[PDB]
Design a protein around this nucleic acid. Structure first.
Lengths: 153, 134, 37
RNA sequence: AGUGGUAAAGGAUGUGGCGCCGCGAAGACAGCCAGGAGGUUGGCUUAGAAGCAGCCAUCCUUUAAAGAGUGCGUAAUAGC
């Protein structure tokens, strides 16, 4: 009685469907304006529980049961928890960045995030509005393993 | 100056009596008798909650274009809800075909919050309930 | 209003106020001045 | 309470006592913050219901989880 078997058995289920979730303080948006950034989530993403506005103690502590390295990024204040795991997190990050940014005074700030398995840095989560299509780590290898003939030209 | 107001008229008629309307023609708008112009528009839209809905520019004007029927209404619009002819219900002309609800939208499922790939299964269950198709 | 008795509140959210053995109901509507002490 | 120091009907977020109910630290309630979500838009009446006018509706998607809208209301509506 009463918080444990209910809701708690789904908070780690829809957030464990993979390994690449995030966290954003969403709320400062009217029902109509709020149903746009969330409802549209399917577009920029794919139902990815981009933090259905959990709360606290439940989402943060939840890390224990699952052991997602404890998304120790930001539990204070609003807690949305952008479920980038249940959808297709990667480059869609931008679809949620500009939306909750280019509209109203700071639509919805971000919090934590796990890069496949690592912890997404606060200051290193926004600038990446566009999930590196893997090309990044590939834009300095093949073009950096064949450029001594380009200064070879 | 500038600032308009929201409004929801019908989908078919145009006669502007009390809808087009102490609403627009007051709080902010122009001209009246939006009916004549409503018929030339709502004619192709009006039978499942169609919001546009009612404004007033510097003319004012005008008809043309539209929105469609509200979610539920637009979901079970292919029913008939011919009921209500007395109290809350409740006899004769009730069903609308199990497939109809789906066939009716189907298309009738574009403009909606966030998005929906089905308004005849989950969308119908809701709106339909408001009418009688629970 | 008063009455050496009765009082089962009223104004849908009419208050049961404890004041001096004074069974006094307080509300937001004069209609309820319930003085039964 | 001065009951001690006569009284019933009956009234009560009196006082103290059970023998019991809510604790999801998946950290409580009164206090707080913000959103108070899109089909929700006639059924009659639509002069207006497009929850906040009367004869019932008891469904759906959708997330802060969802009010078949408990409530200040007029012309619907619009605001709490």
């Amino acid at each position: 009685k009463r918080n444990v078997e209910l809701l708690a058995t789904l908070k780690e289920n829809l957030e464990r469907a993979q390994g690449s979730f995030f966290l954003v303080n969403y709320q400062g948006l009217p029902a109509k304006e709020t149903h746009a950034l969330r409802q549209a989530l399917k577009q920029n993403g794919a139902r990815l529980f981009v933090a259905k506005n959990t709360l606290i103690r439940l989402a943060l502590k939840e890390l224990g049961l699952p052991e997602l390295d404890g998304l120790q990024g930001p539990s204070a204040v609003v807690f949305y928890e952008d479920p980038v795991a249940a959808a297709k997190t990667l480059v869609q990050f931008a679809k949620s960045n500009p939306k909750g940014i280019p509209q109203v005074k700071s639509g919805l700030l971000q919090g934590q995030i796990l890069t496949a398995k690592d912890v997404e840095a606060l200051a290193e989560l926004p600038t990446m509005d566009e999930l590196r299509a893997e090309l990044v780590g590939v834009l300095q290898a093949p073009m950096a393993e064949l450029v001594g003939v380009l200064g070879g030209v | 100056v500038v600032a308009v107001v929201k409004l929801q008229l019908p989908a078919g008629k145009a006669t502007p009596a009390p809808p087009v309307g102490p609403a627009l023609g007051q709080h902010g708008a122009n001209i009246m008798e939006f009916v004549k112009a409503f018929n030339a528009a709502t004619a192709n839209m009006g039978d499942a909650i169609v919001p546009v809905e009612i404004t007033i520019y510097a003319d004012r004007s005008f008809t043309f274009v539209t929105k469609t029927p509200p979610a539920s209404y637009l979901i079970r619009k292919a029913a008939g809800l011919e009921k209500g002819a007395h109290k809350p219900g409740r006899e004769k002309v009730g069903r609308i075909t199990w497939e109809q609800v789906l066939e009716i939208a189907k298309q009738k499922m574009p403009d909606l919050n966030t998005t929906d790939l089905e308004a005849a299964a989950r969308m119908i269950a809701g709106s339909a309930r408001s009418m009688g198709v629970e | 209003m008063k009455v050496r008795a009765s009082v089962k509140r009223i104004c849908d959210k009419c208050k049961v106020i404890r004041r001096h053995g004074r069974v006094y109901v307080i509300c937001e509507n004069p209609k309820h001045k319930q003085r039964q002490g």
